[PDB]
């Protein structure tokens with residue numbers, strides 16, 4: 076039976092490489108604590124370098140899952156409360172209007188006035204501070220979800236302040252070692268640069284993510300297939316992990332509010348399992364991703380849950396999904412974007428087929 080996992084991944088993911096002219100793909104499955112790693116194509120077209128277990132990919136918004144995990148960790152060591160406001164940590168925001176939004180509402184995109192991106196002219200530390208000092212509310216605080224890099228980025232910044240370390244070191248020195256990750260990075264060091272894939276844009280030009288304001292907590296982590304499978308393993312089966320990282324992980328699985336069939340957890344999107352294909356696809360509709368939506372309190376608390384997250388950068392696509400009760404999960408990393416719907420569908424067919 077285990078002999079079917081390679082065939083399934085080949086049937087469902089491998090055709091996407093021709094369809095979308097993607098140079099390189101890594102797809103991992105974890106089932107009953109056994110890891111399966113499927114590698115396709117090249118990490119670098121010009122170098123003819125193969126995708127392998129050392130290949131580093133940009134995770135885009137899947138980085139937010141690390142940020143959420145860092146926040147869960149800081150809460151459980153008593154360094155923050157989710158009821159706190161940012162001005163408790165970043166003193167220059169104390170008594171400004173953004174100091175009425177609490178850390179949870181920042182982590183989960185419900186400030187009521189933060190868009191997907193900062194303005195293009197906002198780049199320096201000084202410009203980021205000014206942006207948040209000048210912030211005024213629009214929608215009632217907590218009522219509307221608008222998916223936002225600045226929102227979760229400020230959450231990450233405040234988590235880092237709570238831990239007295241810059242955010243890059245919170246991940247690289249604390250969170251990643253506690254998860255057993257060996258090649259996961261905010262800043263890919265000199266000695267691993269030969270392992271960092273080129274991304275490829277929609278004109279098939281090689282590209283990597285550009286530096287930008289609070290980029291690390293929003294979309295700035297890079298990792299390998301083995302490490303992302305270890306992360307999914309920690310999400311499915313955290314018992315072997317340190318108690319504090321257990322607590323952190325479990326904090327990320329708690330649904331905070333709902334937008335119909337999508338439950339917003341910390342970083343992760345949560346769903347009742349089994350989820351219809353349309354539930355999973357529509358979680359990343361234009362309506363949910365690009366526009367304000369008024370949230371509700373959770374009414375139906377799912378008994379059996381599954382969780383997912385997409386991520387994209389100019390040159391990379393990522394998708395991660397897991398289902399605790401089936402003890403299965405999947406990770407897809409590409410060095411060209413393909414539509415979210417294809418990532419979600421292929422993972423749906425595969426995970427369903429393996430039971």
Ligand SMILES: *[B@]([O])([C][N]S(=O)(=O)[C]C1=[C][C]=[C]C(C([O])=O)=[C]1)OP([O])([O])=O
Pocket residue numbers: 134135136137224283284285287294364385386387388389390
């Ligand atoms: B995330 O992957 C956020 N998407 S993103 O495109 O905002 C990431 C990004 C932001 C600024 C610059 C770049 C760059 O230079 O590549 C990338 O979210 P999804 O998958 O929508 O949830």
